[PDB]
Structure formats: structure tokens, C-alpha cells
Amino acid sequence: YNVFPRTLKWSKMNLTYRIVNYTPDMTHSEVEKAFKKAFKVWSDVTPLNFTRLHDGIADIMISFGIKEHGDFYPFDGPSGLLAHAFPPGPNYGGDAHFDDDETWTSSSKGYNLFLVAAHEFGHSLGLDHSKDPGALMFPIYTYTGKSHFMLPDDDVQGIQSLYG
Ligand SMILES: COCCN1CCC(C(=O)N=O)(S(=O)(=O)c2ccc(Oc3ccc(OC(F)(F)F)cc3)cc2)CC1
Numbered sequence: 001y002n003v004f005p006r007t008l009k010w011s012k013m014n015l016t017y018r019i020v021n022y023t024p025d026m027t028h029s030e031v032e033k034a035f036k037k038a039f040k041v042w043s044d045v046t047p048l049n050f051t052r053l054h055d056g057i058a059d060i061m062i063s064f065g066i067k068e069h070g071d072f073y074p075f076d077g078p079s080g081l082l083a084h085a086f087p088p089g090p091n092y093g094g095d096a097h098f099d100d101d102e103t104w105t106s107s108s109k110g111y112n113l114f115l116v117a118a119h120e121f122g123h124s125l126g127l128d129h130s131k132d133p134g135a136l137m138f139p140i141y142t143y144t145g146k147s148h149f150m151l152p153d154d155d156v157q158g159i160q161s162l163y164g
């Protein structure tokens with residue numbers, strides 16, 4: 001009948017996410033705003049759009065957990081692993097998990113939830129790690145400097161190579 005795409009990518013442009021639970025470290029508003037901004041990084045340079053769902057099954061299910069949390073990628077307590085996300089697909093596909101033994105912030109302290117979420121949602125949409133140290137998809141955390149976060153070129157090229 002019909003073929004799979006040549007990459008792990010969503011075939012639909014409208015995607016849904018659900019924030020399953022919340023970190024102690026930030027208010028519900030702070031987390032929601034961080035995630036909204038993180039999805040905006042990718043929607044601003046592609047045809048993709050994101051709607052939040054408050055319950056049920058979203059494409060991208062977002063949760064905070066520690067140690068064993070229901071997959072083969074258990075967390076390791078404070079430091080080390082910060083988060084992980086699954087490539088586009090059914091079920092766990094697209095889901096994003098955040099280690100709640102980390103200190104999450106809206107600031108320069110601890111780990112900035114926005115930057116990590118933006119990175120992880122790259123994964124949720126089909127980007128793997130970049131080798132370019134300036135890239136958002138570089139697998140090392142750094143906190144930014146300029147106030148208006150600008151998605152690096154490598155990440156722009158990468159996401160566009162999947163969705164236009
Ligand atoms: C044991 O070694 C760990 C091996 N792994 C690679 C790192 C890691 C991962 O990439 N998972 O997706 S991770 O340390 O939890 C991690 C997660 C998000 C990040 O998000 C970023 C990325 C770049 C940033 O920098 C920039 F903003 F300047 F671009 C900021 C946050 C940075 C690091 C887990 C798996």
C-alpha cells in the first residue's frame with residue numbers, strides 16, 4: 001500500500017503534548033511557560049504546531065521522575081543524566097522524561113528547564129545528537145548568555161531537513 005518515511009519523523013503537522021506531573025522546584029506556571037517556549041523554538045522554524053492536553057493520551061507525554069520510572073532508561077539521581085526523550089513513533093514515541101533529582105529553574109541556577117526541554121523536544125521530533133558544540137542538540141548542558149534565545153544554525157538545518 002504505502003511507505004514509511006525515510007526517517008523517524010511525525011507524518012502529521014499538528015501534535016499534542018501533556019504535562020503528566022510537575023517538579024517541586026518551580027510553580028505550575030513556570031513549568032508550563034518553559035515547555036511552551038521550548039516547543040516554540042521548533043514551531044517558529046517549521047510547519048509544526050503544538051496543542052496542550054490536560055488529560056488522556058497526547059503524542060508527546062511529559063513527566064518528571066526519578067530512578068526507575070517505567071522504561072529501560074532509569075535515572076541516576078542528582079547530576080549525570082538530566083533527561084531523555086524518545087524518537088517520533090507510537091506509544092512511548094515522542095515522550096520526554098526529566099530527572100526530578102535535578103534542580104530545575106527558570107534562571108541560571110541549577111538546570112534551566114527551558115533549555116533542556118528544548119533539547120529533549122528536538123529528540124521528540126526526530127533529531128539525534130549534533131557533534132557541533134554550538135548546537136542545542138549537543139549533548140552537554142550549558143546556560144546561555146543573550147536574552148533572546150536564538151536556535152543555532154545546525155539545529156535549524158537539522159529540523160528543516162525533516163519538516164521544511
Ligand atoms: C552519562 O552521560 C550522559 C549521556 N547522554 C547525553 C546527555 C543527556 C541527553 O542528551 N539526553 O537527551 S543529558 O546530560 O540528560 C542532557 C539533556 C539535555 C540537554 O540539553 C541541553 C543541551 C544543550 C544546551 O546548550 C545550549 F543551550 F547552549 F545549546 C543546553 C541544554 C543537555 C544534556 C543524556 C544522555
Ligand SMILES: [Ca+2]
Pocket residue numbers: 075076077078079080081082099101102
Ligand atoms: Ca540525574
Ligand SMILES: [Ca+2]
Pocket residue numbers: 058059060061089090091092093094095
Ligand atoms: Ca507518545
Ligand SMILES: [Zn+2]
Pocket residue numbers: 069070071073074084097
Ligand atoms: Zn524515561
Ligand SMILES: [Zn+2]
Pocket residue numbers: 119120123129139
Ligand atoms: Zn539529548
